[PDB]
Design a protein around this nucleic acid. Structure first.
Lengths: 7, 534, 490
DNA sequence: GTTTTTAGTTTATTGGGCGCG
DNA sequence: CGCGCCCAGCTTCCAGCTAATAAACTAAAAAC
């Protein structure tokens, strides 16, 4: 699942 | 459907746990502001300006987003040195611009105006150490579910490979995840860039494994993803109950909201035009008689009543409380089954869609429900059920229909209408209409219009139709628009509101191909169909 | 602003002749239903109840054999109670002994009494009879009735016939063909033999359509047709409470004002601003600006294109669908283009995708106009109106991600057992089968209080499953299914 | 003018032990 | 059996934390 900066 | 890593606690209601627990995250943005970050190729923007836009996009999204996620900003390649690990000959040209704090308009203003490109160069692995220190010294005080470090660099400068082992060990022990943002995609760089990239690859593989390589991005792709404001995502509360068929057959189920009319919780507070305070405003609801001269009444002289046609019936909240219809409580009881054709989609009621699965980790319930799902599907039938959220909620009559997809099977629940809500009105027939019957030419013009304006494409070699305009993927423009305006007023209070951003209009309009094709057919329709205002 | 409906009931010998209810009992029960429904929906229409062919007369001009039971007025508890006195076989005996029956009448005089009630918006007379050609024996009466009927139509009074079953059938061409008012383009309902059919036929002619909004459907900037948006379904809610004056039980008016706390003076809309706090800053907008940021397009339906119906998912329901019908009164030529679009959308099994703006200063929503073909039942009642079903489509924000679950599938033996269970509890679903338990109880409660019965009637919950009947109908299938799915230990 | 209806809010509750009447 | 009354997990002592959800509510737009 989209992580970090994208979450 | 969610990933397998997404735990079910996120969907259950517990006292300051589950959905109620804070999904707080600590994020350290590690930006390279070194001399080389300013060097650019004639056709493209400098890495410094590209990374600056990515960071702005990120922070802007976070400011309007519901999350209580905290952000720190470390800069490296700066002229001066200001960090907690500062030594006479150690961690030089590294500055902690912002410490772990909730993002604000002061941060955005600094990113846009105060931050300037540096004239020096710093070790990016040293900057990562300083970034790790920020998390290590500031996550102790508060509760953070996740810790992230985002590095924005061009990998142009020399670095020491001596601290690799401590870097990896601390990231693993502290459960800090990493991400790299570069001026180039991973899938004409200098030799130093090739060296730096190999180390970045090694680091990511050590931390994440094979998947590590997927965490290396270009500023270009990052800008593309972060241009829009955060799409509103909320976790639906799991609803436990038993699907009953008679009084002897029970199936443990867990229901969740799949569709809702989503809204932003924060709204407009009415404030005094001078003090700009809420406390200065007060509303007083006064009561007066229907008869002439407007005779006021005191709250100690008003009773509750209801109208029964021409009759006025006094009925206190106390008496109403006891005579009130009282539901047995939570339920999902099958009343019977019927042909799906007998349930028309025009009769769908309510403000939600419920997806019903078997109770969590219950194989027996899963098999039992799977039997129902497939039987209804194979019989082209649906279930008519009585649904009641809780002992307080008004009971509903609704449809539960099969939903079989790859990796998941469930029943879809939607409320049906009561006799009291059905106005059939009786509309004039248009087929019998001898006056409004279209000519052969008029029908052919509409036929040509429908073909030109098709929003779908066949022959994909999978016998599957490809949708050219998927509306359900587009985020609601009102939120995007509201946030654009709220941001504009915050950074520019004297300036009027900005016009709607072009990309917003671009996502609300069909493909340019559709618009072009329709021109000729539309022209034929304008001539064939006379139109004039009465 | 208040429409008027006069229920005119025949009291001839044949009305009290049959298992199945007498046409009279059917009529009384049908009228009560309209009265009760008009209360449930807080309708402001005026209702009246007149009988003819009775031995007794209660009209203002003392015309023979005409009884005005209820003058034109708002429905209430006492009026409903009064009608209930003529319900069933016991009621039939009460009516005949109170007023008499089978007496000679003259429809012309009957219509005069009715028209006079209006004199003492929309004026409608609903006639309940199983007698076609009542003045066949007297040409002088038949001619006077036609003249009077004609005068009413010329006045603007609508006369609708609710013809009930008669041996050999009810023939409209014999008489009433020159009495009933025709709005014009067979188009007449069949004779009523069941209460349910009489009810729908009456309620269909009773309530007039109300447009939710009159909007422009733009094929492009130049090609614009006019359409009406109608709900067809409306959430049946418990009427909100009303504030009364304790000593007189008189309704009280309520004014909500806004004033400065310090000054105490009234606050104009131009004396206040709108605030929202983000980051660590207060963002101030004018009321005018909060509306401006909500504006996209202009009100209406902007055609995006055509999407095949298969691409529209049933589980992507968001809010109740609306109904689109052409409005010829605004843009001439709207119905012709509408009809063509409808004919071709049906043929191609395609929907018209639109960007929908219901009012000024409101963000747009994507909707799918689903082609809907007209449908009439055995009684000639319009079950499905011809037009487009306005189906609201959810945005990405409106969709909710589901938690992860491993796919566990049942065996053919288990699916087979469930199939047998499904077949056992099969039934015919009709959108009008269930009543709102909450609403029904609320008004039963009000009835007891308005009439001072001191005993509230208890509503029978139609939403509760017929458990005992289901168990008997299933037999051993339940225990069979259990043995194949559920372990001995649970 | 009026009603009708809805878009847009605010607001109380949320679970499961335990004791008593 | 059915009401009400507490405690409930998380932070290197405890006090404030959190968020979906349905019904009730106001205020205003548009039809009438």
């Amino acid at each position: 699942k989209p992580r970090g900066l994208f979450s | 459907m969610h990933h397998h890593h997404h735990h079910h606690h996120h969907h259950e209601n517990l006292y300051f746990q589950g959905v109620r627990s804070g999904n707080k995250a600590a994020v350290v943005l590690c930006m390279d502001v070194g001399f080389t970050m300013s060097n650019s190729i004639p056709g493209i923007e400098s890495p410094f300006e590209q990374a600056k836009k990515v960071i702005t996009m990120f922070v802007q999204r976070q400011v309007f987003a519901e999350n209580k996620d905290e952000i720190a900003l470390v800069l490296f390649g700066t002229d001066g040195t200001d960090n907690p690990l500062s030594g006479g000959d150690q961690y030089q040209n590294i500055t902690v611009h912002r410490h772990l704090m909730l993002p604000d308009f002061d941060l955005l203003e600094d990113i846009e105006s105060k931050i300037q490109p540096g004239s020096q160069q710093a070790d990016f692995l040293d900057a990562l150490i300083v970034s790790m220190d920020v998390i290590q010294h500031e996550t102790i005080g508060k509760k953070f579910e996740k810790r992230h470090i985002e590095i924005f660099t061009d990998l142009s400068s020399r670095f020491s490979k001596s601290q690799l082992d401590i870097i990896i060990h601390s990231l693993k022990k502290c459960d800090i995840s990493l991400q790299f943002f570069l001026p180039f995609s991973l899938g004409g760089i200098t030799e130093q860039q090739k060296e730096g990239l190999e180390i970045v690859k090694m680091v990511m593989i050590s931390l994440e494994g094979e998947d590590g390589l997927d965490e290396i991005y270009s500023f270009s792709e990052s800008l593309r993803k972060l241009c829009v404001f955060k799409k509103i995502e909320r976790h639906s509360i799991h609803w436990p109950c038993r699907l009953t068929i008679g009084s002897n057959l029970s199936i443990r189920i867990a229901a969740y909201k799949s569709i809702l009319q989503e809204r932003v919780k924060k709204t407009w507070t009415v404030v005094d035009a001078k003090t700009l305070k809420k406390e200065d405003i007060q509303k007083e609801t006064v009561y007066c008689l229907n008869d002439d001269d407007e005779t006021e009444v005191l709250k100690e002289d008003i009773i509750q009543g209801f109208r029964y046609g021409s009759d006025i019936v006094p009925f206190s909240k106390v008496d109403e409380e006891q005579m009130k219809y009282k539901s047995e409580g939570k339920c999902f009881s099958v009343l019977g089954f019927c042909k799906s054709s007998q349930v028309q989609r025009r009769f769908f009621m309510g403000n939600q869609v419920l997806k019903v699965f078997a109770a969590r980790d219950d194989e027996a319930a899963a098999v039992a429900l799977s039997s129902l799902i497939h039987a209804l599907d194979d019989l082209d039938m649906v279930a008519i059920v009585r649904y009641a959220y809780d002992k307080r909620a008004n009971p509903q009559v609704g449809v539960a229909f099969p939903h079989i997809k790859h990796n998941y099977e469930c029943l879809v629940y939607v409320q049906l209408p009561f006799m009291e809500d059905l106005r059939q009105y009786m509309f004039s027939s248009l087929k019998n209409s001898k006056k409004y019957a279209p000519t052969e030419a008029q029908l052919n013009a509409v036929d040509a219009l429908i073909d030109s304006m098709s929003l779908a494409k066949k022959d994909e070699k999978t016998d599957t139709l490809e949708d050219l305009f998927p509306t359900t993927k587009i985020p609601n423009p009102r939120f995007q628009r509201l946030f654009q305006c709220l941001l504009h007023r915050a950074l520019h209070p004297r300036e009027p509101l900005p016009p709607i951003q072009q990309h917003i209009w671009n996502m609300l309009n069909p493909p340019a191909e559709v618009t072009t094709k329709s021109q000729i057919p539309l022209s034929k329709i304008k001539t064939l169909f006379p139109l004039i205002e009465a | 602003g208040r429409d008027s409906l006069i229920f005119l009931v025949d009291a001839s010998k044949a009305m009290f002749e049959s298992d199945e209810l007498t046409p009279f009992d059917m009529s009384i029960q049908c009228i009560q239903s309209v009265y009760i429904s008009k209360i449930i929906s807080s309708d402001r229409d005026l209702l009246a109840v007149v009988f003819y062919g009775t031995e007794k007369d209660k009209n203002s001009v003392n015309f023979k054999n005409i009884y005005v039971l209820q003058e034109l007025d708002n429905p209430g508890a006492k009026r409903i109670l009064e009608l209930d006195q003529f319900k069933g076989q016991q009621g039939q005996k009460r009516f005949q002994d109170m007023m008499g029956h089978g007496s000679d009448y003259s429809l012309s005089e009957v219509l005069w009494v009715c028209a006079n009630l209006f004199s003492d918006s929309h004026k409608r007379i609903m006639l309940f009879t199983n007698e076609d050609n009542p003045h066949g024996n007297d040409s002088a009466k038949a001619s006077r009735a036609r003249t009077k009927a004609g005068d009413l139509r010329d006045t603007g009074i609508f006369l609708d016939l609710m013809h009930l079953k008669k041996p050999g059938g009810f023939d409209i061409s014999l008489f009433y063909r020159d009495i009933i008012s025709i709005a014009e383009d067979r188009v007449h309902f069949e004779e009523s033999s069941k209460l349910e059919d009489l009810l729908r036929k009456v309620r269909a002619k009773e309530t007039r359509k109300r447009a939710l909004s009159r909007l422009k459907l733009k094929l492009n900037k130049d090609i614009v047709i006019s359409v009406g948006i109608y709900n067809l379904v409306q959430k049946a809610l418990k009427p909100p409470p009303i504030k009364l004056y304790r000593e007189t039980n008189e309704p009280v008016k309520t004014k909500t004002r806004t004033f400065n706390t310090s000054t105490g003076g009234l606050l104009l809309p131009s004396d206040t601003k709108r605030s929202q706090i983000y980051g660590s800053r207060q963002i101030i907008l004018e009321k005018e600006e909060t509306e401006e940021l909500k504006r996209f397009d202009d009100p209406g339906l902007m055609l995006m294109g055509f999407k095949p119906l298969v691409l529209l998912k049933k589980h992507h329901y968001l809010r109740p669908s609306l109904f689109v019908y052409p409005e010829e009164s605004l843009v001439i030529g709207s119905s012709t283009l509408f009809s063509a679009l409808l004919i071709k959308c049906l043929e191609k099994e395609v929907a018209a995708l639109c960007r929908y703006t219901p009012r000024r200063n409101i963000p747009p929503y994507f909707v799918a106009l689903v082609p809907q073909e007209e449908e009439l039942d055995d009684q000639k009642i319009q079950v499905t109106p011809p037009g487009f079903q306005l189906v609201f489509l959810p945005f990405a924000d409106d969709k909710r991600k589901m938690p992860f679950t491993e796919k566990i599938m049942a065996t053919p033996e288990q699916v087979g057992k469930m199939k047998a269970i499904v077949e056992k509890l099969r039934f015919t679903y009709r959108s009008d089968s269930f009543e709102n338990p909450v609403l029904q109880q609320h008004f039963r409660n009000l009835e007891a209080l308005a009439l001072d019965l001191m005993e509230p009637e208890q509503a029978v919950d139609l939403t509760l499953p017929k458990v005992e009947a289901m168990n008997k109908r299933l037999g051993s299938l339940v225990d069979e299914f259990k043995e194949l799915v559920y372990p001995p230990d649970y």
